[PDB]
Design a protein around this ligand. Structure first.
Ligand SMILES: COc1ccc2nc(C)c(O[C@@H]3C[C@H]4C(=O)N[C@]5(C(=O)NS(=O)(=O)C6(C)CC6)C[C@H]5/C=C\CCCCC[C@H](NC(=O)OC5CCCCC5)C(=O)N4C3)nc2c1
Ligand SMILES: [Zn+2]
Length: 198
């Protein structure tokens, strides 16, 4: 009944993938309990840094990537949820279920990737474990792994970036193509798809 109907919590930033120096590595900034309370209130006072955030709901964890002042992630992770912020929950400014895409204004203190204009096909996928995985672009929204690996290694990395050799954003990781549990290829939202959404 309506008196009892509950509301879903916000997406919460719980860490980041540090790409600052010569070594990529994941950092956790909030533990599970603090994530739970922050999801309910939507008020996140934590300092945000970097381009690739690790984000969580009450039931899922995945990635979100800042490009051109928008923090982008996948609809299958975030749904229509708000994101927690110092001032309370922030409503999505982009939602496209047809592309599996959502976006919020990039949180203050984040750094944004620049959209790639290179037209290169030698890409790099960044995972939630801070692995940098070479990917050859094979189409507008897909690329093959140069070194296949079980899908277990890619789970939780949707919303992460595919980058060009110069470090620009080429796309947002959306799905994995697997055979007998081995990921041979990935699908991603191309940055041009974001650039038109913007
Ligand atoms: C609800 O409204 C929606 C609108 C649009 C929408 N659009 C897509 C494409 C979608 O796809 C599902 C979620 C994807 C996923 O799991 N994303 C990764 C991930 O990590 N998620 S995640 O962070 O763990 C999680 C779940 C958020 C917390 C990156 C995957 C890593 C490992 C794969 C595990 C086995 C799964 C293999 C799948 N393969 C595949 O679907 O291949 C395609 C591509 C070509 C065309 C047809 C087939 C696969 O990847 N997904 C299945 N759901 C929706 C839902
Ligand atoms: Zn580029």
């Amino acid at each position: 009944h309506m008196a009892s109907m509950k509301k879903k919590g916000s997406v919460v930033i719980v860490g980041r993938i540090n790409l600052s120096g010569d070594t990529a590595y994941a950092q956790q900034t909030r533990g599970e309990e603090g994530c739970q309370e922050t999801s309910q209130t939507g008020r996140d006072k934590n300092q945000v840094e970097g381009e690739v955030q690790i984000v969580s709901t009450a039931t899922q964890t995945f990635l979100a990537t800042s490009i051109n002042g928008v923090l982008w992630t996948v609809y299958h992770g975030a749904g229509t949820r708000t994101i927690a912020s110092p001032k309370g929950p922030v409503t999505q400014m982009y939602t496209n279920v047809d592309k599996d895409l959502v976006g919020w204004q990039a949180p203050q203190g984040s750094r944004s990737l620049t959209p790639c204009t290179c037209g290169s096909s030698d890409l790099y996928l960044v995972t939630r474990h801070a692995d940098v995985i070479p990917v050859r672009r094979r189409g507008d929204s897909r690329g093959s792994l140069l070194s296949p690996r079980p899908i277990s290694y890619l789970k939780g990395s949707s919303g992460g970036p595919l980058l060009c050799p110069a470090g620009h954003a080429v796309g947002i990781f959306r799905a994995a193509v697997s055979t007998r549990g081995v990921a041979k290829a990935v699908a991603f939202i191309p940055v041009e798809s974001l650039e038109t959404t913007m």
